[PDB]
Each structure stands twice: as structure tokens, then as C-alpha cells.
Amino acid sequence: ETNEITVGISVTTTGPAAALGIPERNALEFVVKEISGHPIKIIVLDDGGDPTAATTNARRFVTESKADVIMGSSVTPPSVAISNVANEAQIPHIALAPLPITPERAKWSVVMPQPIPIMGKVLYEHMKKNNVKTVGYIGYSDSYGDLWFNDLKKQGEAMGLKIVGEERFARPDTSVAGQALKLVAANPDAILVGASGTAAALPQTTLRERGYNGLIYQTHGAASMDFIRIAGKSAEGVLMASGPVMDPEGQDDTALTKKPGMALVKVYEEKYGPSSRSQFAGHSYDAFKVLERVVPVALKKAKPGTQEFREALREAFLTEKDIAASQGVYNFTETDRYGLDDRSRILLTVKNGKYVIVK
Numbered sequence: 001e002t003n004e005i006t007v008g009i010s011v012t013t014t015g016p017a018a019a020l021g022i023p024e025r026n027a028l029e030f031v032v033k034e035i036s037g038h039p040i041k042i043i044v045l046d047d048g049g050d051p052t053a054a055t056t057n058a059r060r061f062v063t064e065s066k067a068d069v070i071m072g073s074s075v076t077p078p079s080v081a082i083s084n085v086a087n088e089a090q091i092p093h094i095a096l097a098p099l100p101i102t103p104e105r106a107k108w109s110v111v112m113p114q115p116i117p118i119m120g121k122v123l124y125e126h127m128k129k130n131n132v133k134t135v136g137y138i139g140y141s142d143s144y145g146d147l148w149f150n151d152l153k154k155q156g157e158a159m160g161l162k163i164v165g166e167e168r169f170a171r172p173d174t175s176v177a178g179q180a181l182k183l184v185a186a187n188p189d190a191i192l193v194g195a196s197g198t199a200a201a202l203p204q205t206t207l208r209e210r211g212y213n214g215l216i217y218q219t220h221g222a223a224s225m226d227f228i229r230i231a232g233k234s235a236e237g238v239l240m241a242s243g244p245v246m247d248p249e250g251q252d253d254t255a256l257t258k259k260p261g262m263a264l265v266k267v268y269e270e271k272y273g274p275s276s277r278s279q280f281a282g283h284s285y286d287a288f289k290v291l292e293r294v295v296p297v298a299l300k301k302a303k304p305g306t307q308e309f310r311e312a313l314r315e316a317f318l319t320e321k322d323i324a325a326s327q328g329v330y331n332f333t334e335t336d337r338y339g340l341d342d343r344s345r346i347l348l349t350v351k352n353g354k355y356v357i358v359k
């Protein structure tokens with residue numbers, strides 16, 4: 001009847017990715033604190049973006065906290081680390097960063113952020129519409145950057161785009177001077193930046209300061225105010241993939257995403273200020289929207305704090321259809337662990353220091 005549901009959350013609230021995990025943690029103020037008469041005990045720990053710390057946190061959630069579900073992390077490397085733990089421990093995991101889904105990961109993990117090909121397709125279509133022919137890339141030297149570069153090669157080239165340079169940088173790097181000078185020399189019509197948070201603004205500002213005049217495209221990893229704050233004037237004209245949480249006011253009342261998105265941005269921005277909404281707050285909030293749907297189904301089969309409950313939650317991801325959330329409408333399957341479609345994305349630009357939808 002009333003025993004607790006335990007949710008362990010590992011997110012990044014210090015280090016280079018704090019811009020993503022802070023909103024994710026903050027959003028927890030606004031999610032339900034009990035479901036179907038069972039109080040939720042949330043245990044939240046910082047991982048610093050570090051896979052080793054995220055592994056530690058997930059392991060202790062399972063063995064010590066007896067968690068029913070684990071969530072996190074804020075960026076791809078720790079999210080991989082948690083999925084690996086979850087799939088060994090046999091515990092549902094809701095990831096808050098895109099990650100590469102492999103056989104080892106697919107059974108127990110689902111993914112809130114939009115998959116990279118959905119977001120790439122919106123960017124590449126705008127490139128084509130706008131007579132862009134040549135494209136350069138600068139992104140992380142890790143799995144997130146690889147996911148993006150592979151997509152640009154596979155989808156972008158399929159659609160006639162020509163890739164004329166690729167540069168990588170590491171997450172903590174404070175300069176991309178050299179990479180930027182190679183891309184400026186190459187002078188593509190557009191450059192795709194495969195990065196997130198504060199690091200996404202680094203190529204933005206560097207490319208402009210080094211004289212780049214083409215179009216710059218940013219991933220959904222960039223979709224918060226921090227980008228505009230840091231990049232300043234250099235952010236003007238940027239094209240950015242984003243989930244729909246960035247603009248619920250603009251959605252049709254028929255959109256399933258409108259009410260949850262309006263509910264989140266209103267309460268979040270009441271607390272944290274005008275335009276404080278972010279992609280990342282959306283993910284955290286939406287993980288609880290998925291839990292509101294799957295928990296009552298699992299409860300019919302088992303009590304919280306048992307392995308049977310973890311199993312029942314896993315099966316419920318597969319049976320509960322059209323989970324409406326701020327970022328999209330979720331339909332998970334055995335092979336699609338993201339579960340999202342075109343209702344899960346919009347295209348933004350920046351005009352006079354504010355995000356504006358691109359139609």
C-alpha cells in the first residue's frame with residue numbers, strides 16, 4: 001500500500017557539465033513526491049561528469065539503496081557507465097543524455113533525450129533549404145562527438161552535403177584556437193558543433209573571433225540560456241536543434257507535449273527566473289512523467305523494493321504507449337530505447353539575445 005519507491009539519480013552538478021545537471025536536479029522540485037500512495041524517496045548524487053564516479057553511484061544505488069529505478073547522467077560518458085551497471089544489476093535505468101545503445105545496454109535502459117539522427121535530420125534539412133553545400137565539423141573527441149560526426153557523414157552526405165573538414169577537442173579544453181583556424185581556412189558554408197553546455201559556446205565564440213562568416217549549427221546539447229550568456233553576440237544567427245520544451249507557448253493546444261511543457265516552464269521559471277527553461281530540466285521532469293505512467297502498471301504485479309518490481313517496470317516501458325512529456329511523446333520498444341518521433345523536436349535560432357523558433 002504505502003511503502004516507498006526508491007529512485008537513485010546520478011547527475012552532473014560540478015565540473016564542465018554542471019550547466020546540464022544543475023537544471024536536471026533543480027527540476028526535481030517540481031515532480032511528484034509520491035505515486036499511487038507510495039512515497040518516492042529520491043537519492044541524488046553528483047558524479048562530476050566522471051564515468052568512474054557515475055559507476056560508483058549506480059552500484060551503490062542498487063546494492064545499498066535498494067533502488068527501484070536509476071536515472072542519469074547529464075552527459076554521455078557517465079550515462080554509458082550507468083547503463084552498463086543497470087544492465088548487469090537488472091534495474092530500470094532512465095538516461096538523461098543520449099548514448100549509444102548496444103546489446104549490453106538495450107534491455108534495462110531507456111533514453112529521454114532525442115536520438116541524434118532525429119536532431120541531425122532537422123539541421124541538415126535547414127542546410128539544404130538554405131543552399132548550404134559544404135559543411136565542417138568540430139566536436140568532442142568522445143562518443144557524443146562521434147555519434148554526431150557519424151550522423152553528419154551518413155545522413156548529411158546521403159542528402160548531398162559535402163564534409164570538408166573535421167576537428168575534435170576534449171571536454172575540459174579551454175582553447176580550440178587551432179581547430180578553428182583549420183576550419184576557417186577550409187571555409188565551409190556551414191559548421192556543425194558537436195558539443196554541449198559551456199563547451200558548445202567555445203567553438204561559437206572562437207569561430208566568429210577568427211573571422212568565420214558562415215552558418216553555425218549547434219546540437220541539442222547547447223539548448224539552455226548558458227549558451228547565450230557565454231557566447232553573447234557570437235550566438236546571433238545560430239541554428240540549434242532543441243526539444244519542444246523550449247517553446248510550449250507556440251505549440252498548438254492539440255499537441256500532447258503542450259500541457260506538460262507549459263506546466264514545467266511555468267513552475268521552473270517562477271522559481272529560477274524568466275527564460276530559465278532548458279532542454280535538461282525537461283529531461284528530468286519527463287523521467288518522472290514516464291514513472292507516473294509505468295509505476296501504477298508495475299504495482300499491479302509487485303511491491304516496490306523487490307526484483308519483481310524492477311522487472312514489472314521494465315515490461316511496462318514496453319506496454320505503456322504515448323507517454324506525453326514536455327520533450328516529446330514516448331513509445332519504447334525492445335529495439336527503440338529512445339521512443340521518440342518528429343513531435344520531439346524544433347529548430348531554434350538566436351535573435352537579439354533571445355531564442356526564436358525557426359519555421
Ligand SMILES: O=C(O)C(=O)Cc1ccc(O)cc1
Pocket residue numbers: 020074075076077096097098113114144195196220221222279
Ligand atoms: O555532452 C554530452 O555528452 C551530451 O550527451 C549532451 C546532451 C545531453 C542531453 C541532450 O538532450 C543532448 C545532449
